[PDB]
Design an enzyme around this catalytic site. Sequence first.
Site, PDB file in Angstrom:
ATOM      1  N   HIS B  41       0.804  -1.215   0.000  1.00  0.00           N
ATOM      2  CA  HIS B  41       0.000   0.000   0.000  1.00  0.00           C
ATOM      3  C   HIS B  41       0.846   1.280   0.000  1.00  0.00           C
ATOM      4  CE1 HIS B  41       0.329  -0.406   4.531  1.00  0.00           C
ATOM      5  NE2 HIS B  41       0.524   0.892   4.385  1.00  0.00           N
ATOM      6  N   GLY B 143       3.026   5.708   9.511  1.00  0.00           N
ATOM      7  CA  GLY B 143       4.373   5.615   8.988  1.00  0.00           C
ATOM      8  C   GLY B 143       5.180   4.438   9.490  1.00  0.00           C
ATOM      9  N   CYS B 145       4.502   1.272   9.024  1.00  0.00           N
ATOM     10  CA  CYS B 145       4.358   0.089   8.194  1.00  0.00           C
ATOM     11  C   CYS B 145       5.674  -0.227   7.493  1.00  0.00           C
ATOM     12  CB  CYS B 145       3.247   0.297   7.174  1.00  0.00           C
ATOM     13  SG  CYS B 145       1.595   0.137   7.900  1.00  0.00           S
TER      14      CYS B 145
HETATM   15  C1  LIG Z   1       1.060   1.821   7.917  1.00  0.00           C
HETATM   16  O1  LIG Z   1       2.081   2.713   8.338  1.00  0.00           O
HETATM   17  C2  LIG Z   1      -0.203   1.998   8.740  1.00  0.00           C
HETATM   18  C3  LIG Z   1       0.028   1.610  10.200  1.00  0.00           C
HETATM   19  C4  LIG Z   1      -1.148   1.950  11.117  1.00  0.00           C
HETATM   20  C5  LIG Z   1      -1.468   3.436  11.304  1.00  0.00           C
HETATM   21  C6  LIG Z   1      -2.079   3.473  12.691  1.00  0.00           C
HETATM   22  N1  LIG Z   1      -1.337   2.420  13.366  1.00  0.00           N
HETATM   23  C7  LIG Z   1      -0.965   1.446  12.543  1.00  0.00           C
HETATM   24  O2  LIG Z   1      -0.571   0.313  12.864  1.00  0.00           O
HETATM   25  N2  LIG Z   1      -1.286   1.208   8.152  1.00  0.00           N
HETATM   26  C8  LIG Z   1      -2.401   1.797   7.699  1.00  0.00           C
HETATM   27  O3  LIG Z   1      -2.620   3.003   7.830  1.00  0.00           O
HETATM   28  C9  LIG Z   1      -3.436   0.899   7.024  1.00  0.00           C
HETATM   29  C10 LIG Z   1      -3.366   1.039   5.504  1.00  0.00           C
HETATM   30  C11 LIG Z   1      -4.244   0.060   4.729  1.00  0.00           C
HETATM   31  C12 LIG Z   1      -4.101   0.263   3.233  1.00  0.00           C
HETATM   32  C13 LIG Z   1      -3.911  -1.374   5.106  1.00  0.00           C
HETATM   33  N3  LIG Z   1      -4.773   1.198   7.503  1.00  0.00           N
HETATM   34  C14 LIG Z   1      -5.131   0.953   8.769  1.00  0.00           C
HETATM   35  O4  LIG Z   1      -4.376   0.420   9.586  1.00  0.00           O
HETATM   36  C15 LIG Z   1      -6.559   1.332   9.162  1.00  0.00           C
HETATM   37  N4  LIG Z   1      -7.257   0.155   9.659  1.00  0.00           N
HETATM   38  C16 LIG Z   1      -8.397  -0.269   9.130  1.00  0.00           C
HETATM   39  O5  LIG Z   1      -9.041   0.278   8.260  1.00  0.00           O
HETATM   40  C17 LIG Z   1      -8.932  -1.583   9.704  1.00  0.00           C
HETATM   41  F1  LIG Z   1      -7.988  -2.244  10.345  1.00  0.00           F
HETATM   42  F2  LIG Z   1      -9.385  -2.381   8.756  1.00  0.00           F
HETATM   43  F3  LIG Z   1      -9.904  -1.378  10.568  1.00  0.00           F
HETATM   44  C18 LIG Z   1      -6.639   2.537  10.150  1.00  0.00           C
HETATM   45  C19 LIG Z   1      -8.106   2.919  10.367  1.00  0.00           C
HETATM   46  C20 LIG Z   1      -5.898   3.745   9.568  1.00  0.00           C
HETATM   47  C21 LIG Z   1      -6.020   2.185  11.507  1.00  0.00           C
END
Ligand SMILES: *C(=O)[C@H](C[C@@H]1CCNC1=O)NC(=O)[C@H](CC(C)C)NC(=O)[C@@H](NC(=O)C(F)(F)F)C(C)(C)C
Lengths: 305, 305
Positions: B41, B143, B145
């Site tokens: 992503h 950030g 990830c």
């Molecule tokens: C990558 O750096 C981040 C790490 C996240 C940010 C908050 N704490 C973390 O562990 N990953 C994301 O932002 C990720 C991107 C997607 C394209 C996979 N999105 C999420 O983690 C979301 N989660 C969801 O939508 C859920 F888990 F399905 F519910 C949130 C809402 C931004 C946490």
Amino acid sequence: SGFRKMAFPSGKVEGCMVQVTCGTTTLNGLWLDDVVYCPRHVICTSEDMLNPNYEDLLIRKSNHNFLVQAGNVQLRVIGHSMQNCVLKLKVDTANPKTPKYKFVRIQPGQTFSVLACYNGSPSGVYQCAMRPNFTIKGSFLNGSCGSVGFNIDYDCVSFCYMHHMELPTGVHAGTDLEGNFYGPFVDRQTAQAAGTDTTITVNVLAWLYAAVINGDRWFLNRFTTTLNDFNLVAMKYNYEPLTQDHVDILGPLSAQTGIAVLDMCASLKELLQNGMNGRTILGSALLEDEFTPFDVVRQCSGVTF
Amino acid sequence: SGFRKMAFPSGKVEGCMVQVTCGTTTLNGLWLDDVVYCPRHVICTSEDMLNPNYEDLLIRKSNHNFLVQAGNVQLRVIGHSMQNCVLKLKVDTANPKTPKYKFVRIQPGQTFSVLACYNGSPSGVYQCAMRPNFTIKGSFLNGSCGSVGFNIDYDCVSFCYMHHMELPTGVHAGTDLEGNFYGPFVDRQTAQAAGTDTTITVNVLAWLYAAVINGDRWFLNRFTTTLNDFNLVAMKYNYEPLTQDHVDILGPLSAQTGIAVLDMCASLKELLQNGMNGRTILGSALLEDEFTPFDVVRQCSGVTF
Ligand SMILES: *C(=O)[C@H](C[C@@H]1CCNC1=O)NC(=O)[C@H](CC(C)C)NC(=O)[C@@H](NC(=O)C(F)(F)F)C(C)(C)C
Ligand SMILES: *C(=O)[C@H](C[C@@H]1CCNC1=O)NC(=O)[C@H](CC(C)C)NC(=O)[C@@H](NC(=O)C(F)(F)F)C(C)(C)C
């Protein structure tokens, strides 16, 4: 989100660990530029350790009696001296992995990471606090001495602890990198006890702020209190007094959450008087005091090194 | 003595972390030999992340659109491909710090260390367990990830986790280094929930053995039990069943302390039925399940790397 007991990345310290053997005793050394720092009781035998006279023991040793190894490579010792409870072994090779570093003596209540090593090799890393009674709650076995504790700021490693011994309750005592002990302890095997410990009040408050940042908010009540009144209750429960300096240091967390420090103190006062009635805060059933205010900000804001 | 939540030394993993930027999104990559591994992503914008079609998004990108930096130095990308949920960026320079490594997919109940990084730089290290519901209880911000979890055996780094997202209760989900998720989760921002978790029974037992090694012995009773009867009680308290495989794995700890596994199970059964009545075990007021039997032996015997 989430909140974990986080240690500093250990790579910069890993590159400085060596093994020091003198006679039959072996422990760890810290190799910075062309000097190896290690605990002075490397020159003792088991029988020496009951009541050693280190100046005497060391006068009978020369450069070649110290076997220093960095991995496979032996480092040749070309000088030696004793500074308080540490040995300073001058070697003919400067450590090319030497990071930018300083030697600091930390204050009670401040945290650091320990890189636990045996035979000059790392075993693990964990975060520790200097307790008010000048011990640390670590995990150390025979041969762990010379392991060091440290903080990192940007690129600079602040070394603050070198391990020397273990006290009757499974607590640990050591020195700064100048060889001066934290606390009233001496490096000899006679009966020694830590004084009674206390809870680091400023750190508990920082951790409650970390809980609010993470949405664990049940313990916030509607009250405030004066600094004097809070400290009256903290006394009774073996908490350190809160000072204005501590209040000032909690400023960033207070400003970020919009909870005044004395409002937080009111909520802490209730927790102390009423307990937690089976609930947890950030997963913990007891109040946690080994996170400084800086630790909370580092981890909740993602400070990197 | 003493018992701490210990992470692996992070130096070998620190030398592999890079920053990956694609358009406006930036996260961490893992640089091994001449390949950079990162979450897929990185190619999404915020609006893409609600329901991305990654194969489509990636077909519109070329080598030069990926900006990979190791510290200051930019690494030129000369190839790219997608393997499940990870990107494999081929670069024109092999990482000279590449350790001996493997890619493993760990099992529920097994522990690893996470090196949390932002913008390719490390922020901290902490020990985690793969929960039975295929989440981990971490500490991750925007950030983070591309941060990875790992184990070390002798000199070999076994990478087992790369971070991708955070689930509603502040728990975290990710993939192995082949891009396959742990658990039923997908890398898109729609409503997703972890299943109900359970307590890792074998790990609690290992931790009770660690307490006995450290002289915390109050909870040992005079009883034994059958495997079937213990598991009947474990069920009611949301503990995983204990298998003979688990019993066999506790063999070393049982032999070291002289306490049969089923005797330990009898003592655990009482703790579950009666609580801890305000006492602690190894400083903890709750039973701990994020130490494997190996973790206990490593730490109590001083295994080094
Ligand atoms: C990558 O750096 C981040 C790490 C996240 C940010 C908050 N704490 C973390 O562990 N990953 C994301 O932002 C990720 C991107 C997607 C394209 C996979 N999105 C999420 O983690 C979301 N989660 C969801 O939508 C859920 F888990 F399905 F519910 C949130 C809402 C931004 C946490
Ligand atoms: C250096 O590797 C060890 C580290 C110890 C071993 C057990 N866990 C540790 O933290 N230090 C010593 O063995 C040390 C040597 C002296 C010359 C300082 N001795 C002790 O730690 C002893 N402690 C004491 O006699 C006491 F603290 F004063 F009580 C014991 C009895 C070996 C722990």
